Design an enzyme around this catalytic site. Structure first.
Site, PDB file in Angstrom:
ATOM      1  N   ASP A 140       9.749  11.456  -6.246  1.00 27.97           N
ATOM      2  CA  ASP A 140       9.360  10.778  -5.012  1.00 27.97           C
ATOM      3  C   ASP A 140      10.289   9.600  -4.718  1.00 27.97           C
ATOM      4  O   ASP A 140       9.839   8.487  -4.447  1.00 27.97           O
ATOM      5  CB  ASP A 140       7.905  10.302  -5.108  1.00 27.97           C
ATOM      6  CG  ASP A 140       7.364   9.791  -3.785  1.00 27.97           C
ATOM      7  OD1 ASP A 140       7.798  10.290  -2.724  1.00 27.97           O
ATOM      8  OD2 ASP A 140       6.502   8.887  -3.806  1.00 27.97           O
ATOM      9  N   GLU A 147       0.831  -1.200   0.000  1.00 24.32           N
ATOM     10  CA  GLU A 147       0.000   0.000   0.000  1.00 24.32           C
ATOM     11  C   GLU A 147       0.866   1.252   0.000  1.00 24.32           C
ATOM     12  O   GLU A 147       1.659   1.466   0.917  1.00 24.32           O
ATOM     13  CB  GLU A 147      -0.928   0.017   1.216  1.00 24.32           C
ATOM     14  CG  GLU A 147      -2.272  -0.645   0.985  1.00 24.32           C
ATOM     15  CD  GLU A 147      -3.222  -0.451   2.151  1.00 24.32           C
ATOM     16  OE1 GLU A 147      -4.301   0.142   1.944  1.00 24.32           O
ATOM     17  OE2 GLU A 147      -2.891  -0.893   3.271  1.00 24.32           O
ATOM     18  N   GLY A 148       0.711   2.074  -1.031  1.00 21.16           N
ATOM     19  CA  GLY A 148       1.450   3.316  -1.136  1.00 21.16           C
ATOM     20  C   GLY A 148       0.693   4.472  -0.513  1.00 21.16           C
ATOM     21  O   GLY A 148      -0.220   4.270   0.286  1.00 21.16           O
ATOM     22  N   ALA A 149       1.071   5.688  -0.888  1.00 20.48           N
ATOM     23  CA  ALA A 149       0.423   6.884  -0.369  1.00 20.48           C
ATOM     24  C   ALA A 149      -0.959   7.081  -0.986  1.00 20.48           C
ATOM     25  O   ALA A 149      -1.803   7.773  -0.416  1.00 20.48           O
ATOM     26  CB  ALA A 149       1.291   8.104  -0.626  1.00 20.48           C
ATOM     27  N   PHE A 150      -1.182   6.469  -2.148  1.00 15.10           N
ATOM     28  CA  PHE A 150      -2.433   6.642  -2.886  1.00 15.10           C
ATOM     29  C   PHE A 150      -3.026   5.322  -3.379  1.00 15.10           C
ATOM     30  O   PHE A 150      -4.247   5.176  -3.445  1.00 15.10           O
ATOM     31  CB  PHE A 150      -2.218   7.565  -4.091  1.00 15.10           C
ATOM     32  CG  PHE A 150      -1.555   8.867  -3.751  1.00 15.10           C
ATOM     33  CD1 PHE A 150      -2.251   9.861  -3.082  1.00 15.10           C
ATOM     34  CD2 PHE A 150      -0.238   9.102  -4.110  1.00 15.10           C
ATOM     35  CE1 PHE A 150      -1.642  11.063  -2.770  1.00 15.10           C
ATOM     36  CE2 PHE A 150       0.375  10.302  -3.802  1.00 15.10           C
ATOM     37  CZ  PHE A 150      -0.329  11.284  -3.131  1.00 15.10           C
ATOM     38  N   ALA A 151      -2.164   4.368  -3.723  1.00 18.36           N
ATOM     39  CA  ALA A 151      -2.592   3.192  -4.477  1.00 18.36           C
ATOM     40  C   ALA A 151      -2.436   1.871  -3.730  1.00 18.36           C
ATOM     41  O   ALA A 151      -1.683   1.765  -2.763  1.00 18.36           O
ATOM     42  CB  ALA A 151      -1.824   3.127  -5.788  1.00 18.36           C
ATOM     43  N   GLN A 152      -3.177   0.872  -4.203  1.00 17.18           N
ATOM     44  CA  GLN A 152      -3.012  -0.514  -3.785  1.00 17.18           C
ATOM     45  C   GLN A 152      -2.425  -1.306  -4.947  1.00 17.18           C
ATOM     46  O   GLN A 152      -2.872  -1.162  -6.088  1.00 17.18           O
ATOM     47  CB  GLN A 152      -4.346  -1.127  -3.346  1.00 17.18           C
ATOM     48  CG  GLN A 152      -4.824  -0.697  -1.968  1.00 17.18           C
ATOM     49  CD  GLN A 152      -5.209   0.769  -1.902  1.00 17.18           C
ATOM     50  OE1 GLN A 152      -5.541   1.382  -2.916  1.00 17.18           O
ATOM     51  NE2 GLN A 152      -5.167   1.337  -0.702  1.00 17.18           N
TER      52      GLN A 152
HETATM   53  N1  LIG Z   1       6.271  -3.782  -9.356  1.00 19.23           N
HETATM   54  C1  LIG Z   1       5.909  -4.037  -8.079  1.00 19.23           C
HETATM   55  N2  LIG Z   1       6.025  -5.276  -7.553  1.00 19.23           N
HETATM   56  C2  LIG Z   1       5.671  -5.551  -6.286  1.00 19.23           C
HETATM   57  N3  LIG Z   1       5.174  -4.624  -5.451  1.00 19.23           N
HETATM   58  C3  LIG Z   1       5.005  -3.340  -5.844  1.00 19.23           C
HETATM   59  C4  LIG Z   1       5.370  -2.967  -7.217  1.00 19.23           C
HETATM   60  N4  LIG Z   1       5.106  -1.657  -7.350  1.00 19.23           N
HETATM   61  C5  LIG Z   1       4.612  -1.219  -6.166  1.00 19.23           C
HETATM   62  N5  LIG Z   1       4.548  -2.225  -5.269  1.00 19.23           N
HETATM   63  C6  LIG Z   1       4.062  -2.106  -3.873  1.00 19.23           C
HETATM   64  O1  LIG Z   1       2.950  -1.206  -3.804  1.00 19.23           O
HETATM   65  C7  LIG Z   1       3.279  -0.092  -2.967  1.00 19.23           C
HETATM   66  C8  LIG Z   1       2.658   1.201  -3.472  1.00 19.23           C
HETATM   67  O2  LIG Z   1       2.928   1.378  -4.859  1.00 19.23           O
HETATM   68  P1  LIG Z   1       3.442   2.800  -5.407  1.00 19.23           P
HETATM   69  O3  LIG Z   1       3.829   2.632  -6.857  1.00 19.23           O
HETATM   70  O4  LIG Z   1       4.416   3.373  -4.402  1.00 19.23           O
HETATM   71  O5  LIG Z   1       2.088   3.672  -5.356  1.00 19.23           O
HETATM   72  P2  LIG Z   1       1.970   5.059  -4.547  1.00 19.23           P
HETATM   73  O6  LIG Z   1       2.088   6.112  -5.623  1.00 19.23           O
HETATM   74  O7  LIG Z   1       0.603   4.985  -3.908  1.00 19.23           O
HETATM   75  O8  LIG Z   1       3.126   5.037  -3.575  1.00 19.23           O
HETATM   76  C9  LIG Z   1       4.799  -0.041  -2.945  1.00 19.23           C
HETATM   77  O9  LIG Z   1       5.307   0.620  -1.781  1.00 19.23           O
HETATM   78  C10 LIG Z   1       5.167  -1.508  -3.021  1.00 19.23           C
HETATM   79  O10 LIG Z   1       5.148  -2.127  -1.732  1.00 19.23           O
HETATM   80 MG   LIG Z   2       3.495   7.472  -5.719  1.00 17.77          MG
HETATM   81 MG   LIG Z   3       5.102   4.913  -3.429  1.00 12.61          MG
END
Ligand SMILES: Nc1ncnc2c1ncn2[C@@H]1O[C@H](COP(=O)(O)OP(=O)(O)O)[C@@H](O)[C@H]1O
Ligand SMILES: [Mg+2]
Ligand SMILES: [Mg+2]
Ligand SMILES: [Cl-]
Length: 330
Positions: free
Chosen positions: A171, A57-62
């Site tokens: 970021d 889970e990121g700041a915005f997305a799953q």
């Molecule tokens: N290619 C990937 N493979 C596995 N896990 C991922 C991948 N991309 C993102 N994630 C997981 O999803 C989380 C959030 O994705 P992210 O791209 O950071 O979105 P946000 O913009 O919400 O931060 C990451 O911190 C990571 O744990």
């Molecule tokens: Mg992001």
């Molecule tokens: Mg992120």
């Protein structure tokens, strides 16, 4: 300009000669974002997809792991984020084919009225932040220098490629780095999350920004003094990421004698002169026209690495792989 302004981003995406809506791998649907859940099948356009489990889970997305026998990821977000799909598309277009393995490919984007689903490449062995946390739960507490320097060099090399594409990640931090199976074979390190990225090709030559990040701590040097900036934000991000690998906490900077430097007395920090020089150059950029050489930054680290860790790096990564596998099994 405010490079993160939703209106500006909308205007930019609207006025592209090739808008996202025109891509062969873009799919716009006149319906709500379907309910997505772990261990559940759901229709995604023509294809039926099975969602395995939540990866992060990121700041915005799953971000979920999914399959149609190759496994891939689904980045889900409300509202829709065609911007990240745009940047990701441009990055892979501008990058040399030999550089693309250091970044995440987007296979397609499914845009809905209230959200979006970006389909992309999977990296199986968790974030760099998680790797750092795994070391906290061991007697050695911190990542060994061999790995830290190795990852750091890769990071410098990574953003050099991104900046060569005239893109700003915007970021760069530990949870936006992922480790893949290539690491079991800093080879498997990948930089993800282009949601806040900036495409400098969409602005006039020499454009600069004054906008600041929301949090006082995550602000780069130029932000903290209302100074203008563009590429310096990624330099600060790399510096902050390295600082987290070293100390397991987020970097906070102070100003002494006109020079910016990280806080903390830097006790129990080996290669002190190397890191002082590293943080000095990364955090003291004269202006947008005098960006420090990312290559030279990496060479200085590379000198210390070759001097100490070429025969030991093997055992160091094997040690981490065991911790990563232990984490993945749980
Ligand atoms: N290619 C990937 N493979 C596995 N896990 C991922 C991948 N991309 C993102 N994630 C997981 O999803 C989380 C959030 O994705 P992210 O791209 O950071 O979105 P946000 O913009 O919400 O931060 C990451 O911190 C990571 O744990
Ligand atoms: Mg992001
Ligand atoms: Mg992120
Ligand atoms: Cl390298």
């Amino acid at each position: 300009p405010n490079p993160w302004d939703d209106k500006l981003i909308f205007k930019l995406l609207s006025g592209l000669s090739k808008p996202v809506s025109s891509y062969p791998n873009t799919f716009e649907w006149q319906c709500k974002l379907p309910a997505i859940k772990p261990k559940t099948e759901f229709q995604l356009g023509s294809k039926l997809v099975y969602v395995h489990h939540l990866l992060g889970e990121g700041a915005f997305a799953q971000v979920y792991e999914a399959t149609q026998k190759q496994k891939f990821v689904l980045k889900v977000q409300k509202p829709a984020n065609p911007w990240e799909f745009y940047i990701g598309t441009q990055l892979m277009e501008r990058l040399k084919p030999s550089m693309q393995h250091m970044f995440m490919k987007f296979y397609s984007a499914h845009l809905f009225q209230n959200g979006s689903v970006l389909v992309g490449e999977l990296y199986s062995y968790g974030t760099l932040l998680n790797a750092i946390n795994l070391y906290k739960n061991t007697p050695e507490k911190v990542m060994p220098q061999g790995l830290v320097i190795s990852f750091a060099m890769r990071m410098l090399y990574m953003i050099e490629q991104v900046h060569d594409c005239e893109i700003i990640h915007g970021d760069i931090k530990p949870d936006n780095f992922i480790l893949g199976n290539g690491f079991l074979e800093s080879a498997g390190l990948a930089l993800i999350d282009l949601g806040q990225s900036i495409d400098m090709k969409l602005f006039p030559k020499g454009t600069i920004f004054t906008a600041k990040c929301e949090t006082s701590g995550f602000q780069c040097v130029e932000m903290l003094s209302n100074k203008p900036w563009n590429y310096q934000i990624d330099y600060f991000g790399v510096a902050a990421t390295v600082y987290c690998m070293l100390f397991g906490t987020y970097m906070k900077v102070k100003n002494e004698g006109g020079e910016c430097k990280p806080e903390g007395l830097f006790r129990r920090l080996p290669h002190l002169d190397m890191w002082n020089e590293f943080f000095h150059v990364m955090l003291n950029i004269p202006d947008c026209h005098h960006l420090p050489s990312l290559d030279l930054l990496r060479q200085k680290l590379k000198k210390v690495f070759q001097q100490h860790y070429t025969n030991k790096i093997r055992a160091l990564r094997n040690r981490l792989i065991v911790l990563l596998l232990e984490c993945k099994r749980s």
